[PDB]
Structures are given as structure tokens and as C-alpha cells.
Amino acid sequence: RPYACPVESCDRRFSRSDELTRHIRIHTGQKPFQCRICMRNFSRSDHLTTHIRTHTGEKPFACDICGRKFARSDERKRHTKIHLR
DNA sequence: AGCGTGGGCGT
DNA sequence: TACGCCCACGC
Ligand SMILES: [Zn+2]
Ligand SMILES: [Zn+2]
Ligand SMILES: [Zn+2]
């Protein structure tokens, strides 16, 4: 973690330069991705793709046990667990 | 439950 | 650099 955040309030260190650049955004308020539908702005590309799903209702991940659908895999993961109890 | 959003990192 | 996953936390 040879990359440190120069913001005198922030404590963060990163392994690559791109992690730092990305991180900077929290400091600068830069939200480079706009949702085409609601115009809302987002700091990341991946976050934008997942948020759009809220508009379209697209759910690419289904539970293997019950077939319940989710917009995100993390949502799926959180859910499969319930089948243990 | 739904979903914003940061961190780690393969590529 | 940039993307796009996973993974996790928080409300
Ligand atoms: Zn910082
Ligand atoms: Zn939107
Ligand atoms: Zn299920």
C-alpha cells in the first residue's frame, strides 16, 4: 500500500494507483456516470449498471434452491443462506 | 428486502 | 489508466 490518500483528514493507503484515483472521488465529489433514465449521478460504472436495474426490473440472479430472482449477486448470496434456516 | 456505495483486484 | 466482478457494510 504505497499509495496514500493526501487528504489530511483521510487515512487510506492502496496497492495500485487506480485504486487511489477511484478513491479520490469521495473527496472530490466527482460522479462521472449519469443514469440515462433518472439523470442521477454515480461515482462508479459498476454501480451505475446495477442501479439501472431498479428502473428496468431486470434480475439476472436466481436462487438455485427456490428460483427467487435478484438484481445483484450479493443479494442472491445473502438469500441462499436462508435455506439452511 | 432493496439498494447506495466503498474496497480489493484480475484483467 | 479502465472495466467489471466479488465481497461487505449500512440504512
Ligand atoms: Zn481519502
Ligand atoms: Zn436511475
Ligand atoms: Zn432461495
Q: What is the resolution of this structure in A?
A: 2.1
Whether residue A36 sits in one domain with residue A26:
no
- Domain total for chain A? 3
Q: End-to-end alpha-carbon separation of chain A, Å?
A: 40
Asked if residue A35 lies in contact with residue A53, where contact means CB atoms within 8 angstroms, the answer is no
**What range defines the domain where residue A1 resides?**
1-30
Rounded distance, CA A64 to CA A73, Å? 12
Whether residue A69 sits in one domain with residue A49:
no
Reported as half-sphere exposure (CB side, CA atoms, 13 A), residue A82 has a value of: 10
Rounded distance, CA A10 to CA A24, Å? 10
The size of chain A, in residues, is 85
Helix (H) or strand (E) holding A24, with range, is helix A17-28
* Spacing of A43 CA from B7 C1' in Å: 14
Whether residue A26 sits in one domain with residue A8:
yes
Expt. technique: X-ray
CATH number at residue A67: 3.30.160.60
Whether residue A39 sits in one domain with residue A15:
no
Rounded distance, CA A38 to CA A55, Å? 9
Whether residue A75 sits in one domain with residue A52:
no
* Per-residue buried b or exposed e for A51-62, using 16+ beta carbons within 10 Å of the residue's own CB: bbeeeeeeeebe
Whether residue A65 sits in one domain with residue A79:
yes
Give one DSSP letter per residue of A26-78, joined into a string. HHH----EE-TTT--EES-HHHHHHHHHHHH----EE-TTT--EESSHHHHHH
Q: Using a 7 Å CB cut-off, which residues contact strand B?
A: A 12, 14-16, 18-19, 22-23, 25-26, 42-44, 46-47, 50-51, 53-54, 70-72, 74-75, 78-79
